[PDB]
């Protein structure tokens, strides 16, 4: 539809609409596909998933931290922003939670997932890098933190950068999306003491060997 | 969420019964679901499942190749063709949410609260 | 198929006496089990999933854990409220297959 990958796959919330396929033999955007990333920032290697995503024998998407139980300690409903509103309420992407502070802390974040079932599975998330230490306060309490991210393949420690930057959409912060394959029978972790969005869900999947992406108007 | 079942009653063994599950609070058409079944002997046992987009099913060999399970997403509902009824399809029946769209990855986490279906 | 063996089919104790009961699966399921509660009158309630996760809004009373073959629930000190049949479930492979269940009364 309006869409582009990257609003698909992280879930603006203008393609919840969309359904969802089990396979397809390549994927159709319109030249007016302006629906992708609504909190701006940089999505990392999106031309290779773009690639990896054009031909899919197999998919589907399943939750994999709960929204309710998987963070007890932190606070995950005041993770919303005007950046990406729904039906003029301020909202967030629909595969992604940004967890805050809960109370007056932000304890150390640890969790895992083990992929046992077979097929690889694609993970998400994302880093927010505030606009003033103000932000960092609000948000995350912790003044001085890092994200860290791995699998038997995928190895990161990330650090804020706090930074006024040009406004876009209202934002004068970034945030900026990652994205890894956990291969069948490999774990993926999480750490953090801030400035963290976590997956909610993840998709998986089995890829037919890779077509095209079509552009245009031309009707399916 | 809710999911409410819908149908049910007292039937003669042959014939059918059909069975709906109307869906709120979520997006039905992005999540597969089930059909479960109660029995009064039988604690708990299970009858079909249809993944999010209604591409795919699969039934339990007690019903396979007698029920059919199918969906309307644009109406987000859920139904259950309970053809050639016996006895021993007694049961209270549930709907539930998956939270996952291809079967094999999941957890069905939301169930209704059932209706009861009777043959004799 | 994969089939659970739940036992006991029927346990009782005093409040706040220490509740636990077993289930086995014929097959190695890794960790894949769904604990459920119902309350008579009530669809089954999802309390413990993947078998050791507390599920949202059940109390700390409830544990479980194992893997393979053999698994484990735990209501610690038992409460009144807890009143139900108890049910295992897993999700291995298809068919999805229940324990027989085990009544929990207080007394």
């Known amino acids: 539809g309006k869409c582009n990958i990257a609003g698909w796959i992280l879930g603006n919330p203008e393609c919840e609409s969309l359904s969802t396929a089990s396979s397809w033999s390549y994927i159709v955007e319109t030249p007016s596909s302006d629906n992708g990333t609504c909190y701006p920032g940089d999505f990392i290697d999106y031309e290779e998933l773009r690639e990896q995503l054009s031909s899919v024998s197999s998919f589907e998407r399943f939750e994999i931290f709960p929204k309710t139980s998987s963070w007890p300690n932190h606070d995950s409903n005041k993770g919303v922003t005007a950046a990406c509103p729904h039906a003029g309420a301020k909202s967030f992407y629909k595969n992604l939670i940004w967890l805050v502070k809960k109370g007056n802390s932000y304890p150390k974040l640890s969790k895992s997932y083990i992929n046992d079932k077979g097929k690889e599975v694609l993970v998400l998330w994302g880093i927010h890098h505030p606009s003033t230490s103000a932000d960092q306060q609000s948000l995350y309490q912790n003044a001085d933190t890092y994200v860290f991210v791995g699998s038997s393949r995928y190895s990161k420690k990330f650090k804020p950068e706090i930074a006024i930057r040009p406004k876009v959409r209202d934002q004068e912060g970034r945030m900026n999306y990652y994205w890894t394959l956990v291969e069948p029978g490999d774990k993926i972790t999480f750490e953090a003491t801030g400035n963290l969005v976590v997956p909610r869900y993840a998709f998986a999947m089995e890829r037919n060997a890779g077509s095209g992406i079509i552009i245009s108007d031309t009707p399916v | 969420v809710q999911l409410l079942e819908s149908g049910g009653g007292l039937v003669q063994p042959g014939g059918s019964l059909s069975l709906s599950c109307a869906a709120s609070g979520f997006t039905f058409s992005s999540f597969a679901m089930s059909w479960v079944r109660q029995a009064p002997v039988k604690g708990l046992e299970w009858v079909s499942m249809?993944?999010?987009?209604?591409?795919?099913?699969y039934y339990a060999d007690s019903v396979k190749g007698r029920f059919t399970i199918s969906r309307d997403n644009s109406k987000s509902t859920l139904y259950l063709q309970m053809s050639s009824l016996t006895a021993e399809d007694t049961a209270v029946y549930y709907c539930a949410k998956s939270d996952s769209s291809g079967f094999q990855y999941g957890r069905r986490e939301f169930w209704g609260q059932g209706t009861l279906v009777t043959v004799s | 198929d994969i089939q659970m063996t739940q036992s006991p089919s029927s346990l009782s104790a005093f409040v706040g006496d220490r509740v636990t009961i077993a289930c086995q699966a014929s097959?190695?399921?890794?960790?894949?089990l769904n604990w459920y509660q119902q309350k008579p009158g009530k669809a089954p309630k999802l309390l413990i999933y993947d078998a050791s996760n507390l599920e949202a809004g059940v109390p700390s009373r409830f544990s479980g854990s194992g893997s393979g073959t053999d698994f484990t629930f735990t209501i610690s000190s038992l409460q009144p409220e807890d009143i139900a049949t108890y049910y295992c479930?897993?999700?291995?492979?298809?068919?999805?297959?229940f324990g027989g269940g085990t009544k929990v009364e207080i007394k």
């Open positions: 479930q897993h999700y291995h492979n298809l068919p999805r297959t």
């Open positions: 097959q190695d399921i890794r960790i894949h």
């Open positions: 249809i993944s999010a987009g209604g591409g795919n099913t």
